[PDB]
Amino acid sequence: KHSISDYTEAEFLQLVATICDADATSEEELDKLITHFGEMTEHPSGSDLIYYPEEGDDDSPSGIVNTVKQWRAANGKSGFKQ
Amino acid sequence: PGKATGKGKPVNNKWLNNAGKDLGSPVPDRIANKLRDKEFKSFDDFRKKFWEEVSKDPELSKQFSRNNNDRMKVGKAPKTRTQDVSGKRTSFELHAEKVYDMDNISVVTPKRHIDIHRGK
Ligand SMILES: [Zn+2]
C-alpha cells in the first residue's frame, strides 16, 4: 500500500467497497482506510467523494473508483496496476 | 435503563446547516416522538438509536447521502464534510447542555463542539 499504482483496480475496488460498508469496520479502521484513500487518490475532494457526492455522480464503489480513475487521468497522474 | 423525554423542534430540509454555530441543530420533533417510546442503556445507546431514527425519517434521510444513511442505520453518526473535520473527529457530534432531556441535546460539528467547551 504505497501508491495508487501499487494497486490493481480490483484491489482498489475491494478497498472502496469496504469503506462503503458500515458494518465492515470499527470506527478506527474506517478511519485508517479513509485516510489511506485520500493519500492514494490525491483527489482534492477526499471523502466528500464518499459522503457528499455531487449531484448525479455514481456513488457506488465502482462509481467512486471510476471517478478517481477518470480524474487521475486527466491530470495525468499514474494509474492502477495492470 | 435510561429514558428520553423532551419535545424537540420542528426543522427544515437543511437540518444540519446550523450545526456549525451557537448550540447547533435541535432534536427534531418527529424523532423525539419516537425516541420517547424507547428504553436505553446509556447515552451511547441513546446516540445509536438517535441516528437510526434519523435514517428512517423520510424528510431527514433525504438530506443525507447513501453512504451516510448506511452509517446511521447501524447507529454511527454521519461523516461531516472534510472542511468541518478536526483531527480524528470526522462525524457529527451530540452535545449536552447538561436520562435524557432531548430539549437540551443538540447536533454539532466537531469544530463547534470544540469551541463551545473552550468557551467560544
Ligand atoms: Zn458537549
Swiss-Prot record, chain A:
One of its GO terms (biological process) is bacteriocin immunity. It holds the Pfam family Colicin_Pyocin. Coiled coil: none annotated. GO terms for cellular component: protein-containing complex. This protein is able to protect a cell, which harbors the plasmid ColE9 encoding colicin E9, against colicin E9, it binds specifically to the DNase-type colicin and inhibits its bactericidal activity. Keywords: Bacteriocin immunity, Plasmid. GO terms for molecular function: protein domain specific binding; toxic substance binding. It comes from the Bacteria. The gene is imm. This is Colicin-E9 immunity protein. Belongs to the colicins ColE2/ColE8/ColE9 and pyocins S1/S2 family.
From Swiss-Prot, chain B:
Residues 57-101 are annotated as: Disordered. It comes from the Bacteria. Residues 86-98 have a biased composition (Basic and acidic residues). Zn(2+) binds at residues 95, 113, 117. This plasmid-coded bactericidal protein is an endonuclease active on both single- and double-stranded DNA but with undefined specificity. Belongs to the colicin/pyosin nuclease family. This is Colicin-E7. It comes from Escherichia coli. The gene is colE7. The chain holds residues 450 to 576 of 576 of the full protein.
